[PDB]
Amino acid sequence: EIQFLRTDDEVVLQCTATIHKEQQKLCLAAEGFGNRLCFLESTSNSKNVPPDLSICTFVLEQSLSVRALQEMLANHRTLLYGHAILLRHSYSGMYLCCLSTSRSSTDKLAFDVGLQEDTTGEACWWTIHPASKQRSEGEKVRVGDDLILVSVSSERYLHLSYGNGSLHVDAAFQQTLWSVAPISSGSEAAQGYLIGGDVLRLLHGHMDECLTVPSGEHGEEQRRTVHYEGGAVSVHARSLWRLETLRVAWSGSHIRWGQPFRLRHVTTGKYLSLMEDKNLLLMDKEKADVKSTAFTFRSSKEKLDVGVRKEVDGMGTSEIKYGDSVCYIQHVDTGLWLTYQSVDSIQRKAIMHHEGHMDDGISLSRSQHEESRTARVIRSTVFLFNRFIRGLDA
Amino acid sequence: NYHNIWAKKKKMELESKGGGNHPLLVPYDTLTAKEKAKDREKAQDILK
Amino acid sequence: NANVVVRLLIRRPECFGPALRGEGGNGLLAAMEEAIKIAEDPSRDGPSPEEDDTIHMGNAIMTFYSALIDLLGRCAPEMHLIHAGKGEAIRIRSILRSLIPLGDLVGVISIAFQMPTIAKDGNVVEPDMSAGFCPDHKAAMVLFLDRVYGIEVQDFLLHLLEVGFLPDLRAAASLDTAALSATDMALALNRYLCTAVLPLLTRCAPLFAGTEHHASLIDSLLHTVYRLSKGCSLTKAQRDSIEVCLLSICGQLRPSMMQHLLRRLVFDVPLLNEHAKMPLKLLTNHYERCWKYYCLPGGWGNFGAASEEELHLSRKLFWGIFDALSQKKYEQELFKLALPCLSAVAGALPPDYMESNYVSMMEKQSSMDSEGNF
C-alpha cells in the first residue's frame, strides 16, 4: 500500500537541476550554527562524494489547515495538500522560514530562505500544493509525490535559481518542483536498535577501549591514522563515528546485517577507508569513494557472504541491537576483517586482515544527541576558526 | 543683495536673448539652502 | 478584488514590464529615465518609415508604468484595516512594498519636466503633451507613496519636499505669467499639484511642527504656495485646496518661521481684493493661535518672544487693513471676514507697544516692487 507522509516524519526536500544537460539531484541543506541561510547538497554523485544528509533532514512537526493556522496566529496526522507544514531542521532544531532579507542574487523580488528559532509568526509556516492535476486539494500526500511549497508570509515559491552563477535556494515568484524523500519515521523506530545516521562508539571485544584517532597534536596528517585506545577517550568526542548508508531514501532505517555503509569521524569530518596497502586511513570527503569507504556489520567471522539482498523501502526490521550484539566490520570489496595489529593508552593499531583474531567482536554504544551535536559544533567551529587564522596570517 | 545683482544681470541676459526663464530667478526668500549655499558662503568668507 | 489582482500579478510577474520582472530589471527610476531618453530620440519614439499614427513610445512606456503603480497603490489595503492589524492586509502591503522600492518612487518624483518657453517672436513654444513626461505620471507615484509606504516620519517628509515636491511648486509658480498661464502644461501641472501634492501636505500637516533646522525649506514652501495661490488659471476647487493646505500648514508651523510670509502678506492684504480673503483667514488663525507670543513679554518658553521687527510689521499690517477697510465700499463677506482679523491683530499686539524709534530704512527693494515682487 502506498505510503503517506504523516507528522513527526524525518524527510529531505529534493530538487532537480539540469546543469549543462545532465540531471543533478540536490537536497535542501542548512547548517545551524554559523550562517543561517540555507544551501544545496548534491546527492547525485554519491559514489564519488558522500552526501551530508545530517544537515539536510527535516521533520514535519505540525500540519494544519489554512484557517486553523490563521486562527492560531490571530489568537500523527496525515499530511494533505493545502495544509501548512512546520519543518524543523533536525540537526539545529530550528525551523525553515523566509528571512525577509535578500542577498540580491539578481532577483530583486526574491527573499532568502533559512532557519528561524521561534515558531511564532507566519514566516516559519509553509503550505504544500499539488504538483500536477493528478493530485487535488485535501488529497493525501504520497511519499513519491512532488510538492509545491509556498511561503505563507510572502506567497513566494521555494525556488531553485539557475541564473546566478552558483545554484541557490530562495523564495521567488517562479515555482520549483520539490520531491520529498522519507528518511525515517519516528514512531516505527525500535528503541535500542541501530538505525542509519546514528553517532556511535565502536567498543572493542574488551568493552573497555574503542576505535579512536590520535589526539590533537595539531597535526591533521597524524589525525588521519586509526588505532585502538582506551580510557577517557571513550567519553571524549574523538571516539564518535557516524554511520551513513549508501542510500538517500530511508537512510534512517534499521541497519541489517551485511548492509553497506560509510563510517565518518564526526570531529574531523573524514571517512574511514581502506587504502590499497591494507591499512585503515581517514581520507577526505571529496575523494571518499564507495570502493574504499564501504563497510558492513556481519554477525559472524564465517566467510559465507550475504550476496545480494533486497533493498526494502521502509523502516526495515530491527536486527542490530546496541550494547549486546557482537559485530564484525568487514570491508565490502576486499572482504578483509578489521582487527587490532596487537603490537606492544594501549594505542593498538587497527589493521585490515584476511582472518583477523579470535576477539574481533566490536560492540556498539549509541552516543547522546547532545554529545553528537557538540561534536558537530566543534568540527564547524574548528573549520571556521582555522579559515579565520589562515586569512589573518595571509 | 548679491543674489539681486546676479538676478538683475541674468534678467538682462534673458531679455537680451528675447525669450526664456531660469528656475533660480525666484526671490532669495523663495530660494533653498542648497541654492543659497554659494552667496551665503561668499558673504561668510568676506565677513570672516 | 484587490487581493486577487495582487496575487495574480505576483504569480505572473511579466505583467510588471521588463524593468520590474525582477530578473535584470533596472528599476522604475531607470525605466523612466530610459523612456525619457527614448521619447527625446526621434528614431525609437516614432515608427520612422499625425499623433495616432505616431505613438510616442517613451510616453507609452511611462503611461504603462504609471498605470501599474496607480493600480498597485489602489490595491493597497485601507489604513483602518492596517491599524486593526488584519494580517492579510498587512501581508498585502508588505508584498507591495517589496514589489516597489521607495527610492525609485522618490526619484521619479524628483525628475523635473521641460517648461514651455516664450520664443523670440513672443509666442509660447509649448512642448507636446503626448511626447514627453506628464505630471499625471507622478500623480501615481504620489498615490502609491501615500497609500502603501505612507508618509509617517518627519525627516523623510522634509526630504521629499526638498527633492521632488518643491521644484514642481516653483515651476508652477514661475508659469504664473499672463502668457504662460494659459499653456496646457501649466494647467496639467496645477491639476497634478492641487489633486495629489497639496492634499498630501494637508494630510501630513502635524509632522511640520519640529522643523527648526529646515527654516529655509519651510519658508520656500509657504512662499511658493502663496505665489501659486495668487494665480488666474486656478479653478475654484484648486484654489480651495490651496487655501486649505496653506491654513493647515501655517497652523502647525512655529510663529517665528512664517515671518517672511508675513512681510508679503502685509503688502497684499491692504488691497482688499478677492485674492485677499485667504490671507485674511491665515492672519486671523495665526494671530489667534499665537496671541500670547506677542503680548506677553516672555511668551512661550520654547518659541520665545517677538523680535520687534514682526511687531512693527504687525502694527503696519493692522493700520493698513483698518484704513483700507474704512475707505472700501461695503461688501458683506469681506467685512464679516476682516473683522476677526483686525480684532485678532489688535489683541495680539501689546497695548503698550513702543513704535520703533529706529525705523527700518532701505528695506528689501523687492518688497516695494509690485510687478510680481521678483
Strand-pairing partners, residue A327, are A362
B25–C219 C-beta distance less than 8 A: no
For residue C322, the one-letter residue type is F
For residue A57, the one-letter residue type is T
C25 Cβ neighbours under 8 A, 6+ residues apart? A108, C18, C19, C31
C162–B32 C-beta distance less than 8 A: yes
Among C7, C10, C22, select the one facing A107 at the smallest CB separation: C22
Among A107, A122, A154, select the one facing C23 at the smallest CB separation: A107
C250 Cβ neighbours under 8 A, 6+ residues apart? C222, C258, C261, C282, C285, C286
Closest CA to A231 of A239, A242, A219: A239
- What is d(CA C175, CA C157) in angstroms, rounded to the nearest whole number? 25
Confirm or reject contact between B33 and chain C (CB < 8 A): yes
Closest CA to A89 of A27, A150, A46, A146: A27
Residue numbers in B near C120 (CB within 8 A) = 17-19
DSSP labels, C231-269: -SS--HHHHHHHHHHHHHHHHHS-TTTTHHHHHHHHHHG
- What is d(CA C240, CA B38) in angstroms, rounded to the nearest whole number? 37
> If you count residue pairs, one on B and one on C, with CB atoms under 8 Å apart, how many are there?
53
Contact A33, A380 (CB under 8 A): yes
Confirm or reject contact between C259 and chain B (CB < 8 A): no
Confirm or reject contact between C118 and chain B (CB < 8 A): yes
Confirm or reject contact between C13 and chain A (CB < 8 A): yes
How many residues are listed for chain A in this entry? 394
How many other CB atoms sit within 10 Å of the CB of residue C135?
A: 22
- What is d(CA A209, CA A202) in angstroms, rounded to the nearest whole number? 9
Closest CA to C248 of C193, C284, C206, C191: C206
**H helix count then E strand count, chain C:** 21, 2
Residue numbers in A near C95 (CB within 8 A) = 154-155
Contact A266, A375 (CB under 8 A): yes
Confirm or reject contact between A112 and chain C (CB < 8 A): no
For residue A98, the one-letter residue type is C
C237 Cβ neighbours under 8 A, 6+ residues apart? C194
Strand A111-116 relative to strand A95-98, pairing:
antiparallel
**3-state SS class at A298:** strand
Residue numbers in C near B29 (CB within 8 A) = 219-220, 223, 260
| Distance (Å) from the alpha carbon of C118 to chain B's nearest alpha carbon | 5
Among C24, C95, C101, select the one facing A155 at the smallest CB separation: C95
Among C10, C24, C101, select the one facing A155 at the smallest CB separation: C10
Q: In chain A, after which residues does the backbone break, taking C–N over 2.5 angstroms as a break? A: 75, 344
For residue A323, the one-letter residue type is G
Per the structure block, which three cell numbers stand in for A287?
A: 575523494
Distance of CA A234 to the CA centre of its chain: 23
Confirm or reject contact between C87 and chain A (CB < 8 A): yes
Closest CA to C95 of A86, A122, A137, A75: A122
Distance of CA C129 to the CA centre of its chain: 22
**3-state SS class at C333:** helix
Closest CA to A175 of A207, A194, A150: A150
- What is d(CA C320, CA C342) in angstroms, rounded to the nearest whole number? 10
Contact C56, C130 (CB under 8 A): yes
Q: Neighbours of A (≥3 Cβ pairs closer than 8 A)?
A: C
C122–B19 C-beta distance less than 8 A: yes
Strand A146-151 relative to strand C124-125, pairing:
unpaired
Element (H, E) at A350: strand A348-353
Per the structure block, which three cell numbers stand in for C178?
A: 499672463
Closest CA to A111 of A103, A122, A119, A120: A103
B4–C220 C-beta distance less than 8 A: no
* Nearest residue in chain C measured CA to CA from B17: C120
Q: Between the CA of residue C350 and those of C89, C270, C280, C294, C304, what are the distances in Å?
A: 55, 22, 20, 7, 15
Q: Kindly provide the residue ranges of all beta strands, DSSP E only, lying in chain C, ordered along the sequence.
A: 117-118, 124-125
Confirm or reject contact between A67 and chain C (CB < 8 A): no
How many other CB atoms sit within 10 Å of the CB of residue A298?
A: 19
How many other CB atoms sit within 10 Å of the CB of residue A19?
A: 11
Residue numbers in A near C24 (CB within 8 A) = 106
Among C7, C87, C101, select the one facing A155 at the smallest CB separation: C7
Residue numbers in C near B27 (CB within 8 A) = 223, 366, 373-374
Residue numbers in B near C174 (CB within 8 A) = 21, 23, 25-26
How many other CB atoms sit within 10 Å of the CB of residue A105?
A: 16
How many other CB atoms sit within 10 Å of the CB of residue A300?
A: 10
Strand-pairing partners, residue A140, are A80
Among B7, B20, B25, select the one facing C117 at the smallest CB separation: B20
Closest CA to A183 of A143, A139, A147: A143
A173–C22 C-beta distance less than 8 A: yes
- What is d(CA C248, CA C205) in angstroms, rounded to the nearest whole number? 6
For residue A193, the one-letter residue type is Y
Per the structure block, which three cell numbers stand in for B28?
A: 532669495
Interior/surface letters A192-231, b for 16+ CB within 10 angstroms, e for the rest: ebbbbbbbbbbbbbeeebbbbbeeeeeeeeebbebbbbbe
Q: Kindly provide the residue ranges of all beta strands, DSSP E only, lying in C70-167, ordered along the sequence.
A: 117-118, 124-125
Q: What is the largest CA-CA distance in chain C?
A: 81
Contact C69, C100 (CB under 8 A): yes
Among C27, C91, C98, select the one facing A109 at the smallest CB separation: C98
Distance of CA B46 to the CA centre of its chain: 18
Confirm or reject contact between C49 and chain A (CB < 8 A): no
How many other CB atoms sit within 10 Å of the CB of residue B25?
A: 15
Residue A280 main-chain phi, psi, to 5 deg? -80, 135
Way it was determined: cryo-EM
A379 Cβ neighbours under 8 A, 6+ residues apart? A266, A267, A268, A269
Q: Do the two chains A and B touch, given a threshold of 8 Å on CB pairs and at least 3 pairs?
A: no
Contact A130, A149 (CB under 8 A): no
- What is d(CA C313, CA C155) in angstroms, rounded to the nearest whole number? 32
Q: What is the largest CA-CA distance in chain B?
A: 40
Contact A94, A20 (CB under 8 A): no
**CA end-to-end span of chain C, whole Å?**
52
Q: Do the two chains C and B touch, given a threshold of 8 Å on CB pairs and at least 3 pairs?
A: yes
Per the structure block, which three cell numbers stand in for C337?
A: 471676514
Between helices A66-74 and C87-99, what is the axis angle to 10°? 100
Owner of C-alpha cell 461688501 = C331
- What is d(CA C140, CA C203) in angstroms, rounded to the nearest whole number? 17
Owner of C-alpha cell 491599524 = C83
Closest CA to A327 of A302, A362, A355: A362
Contact A149, A128 (CB under 8 A): yes
C87–A153 C-beta distance less than 8 A: no
Handedness of CA A74, A78, A84, A85 (dihedral sign): positive
Confirm or reject contact between A66 and chain C (CB < 8 A): no
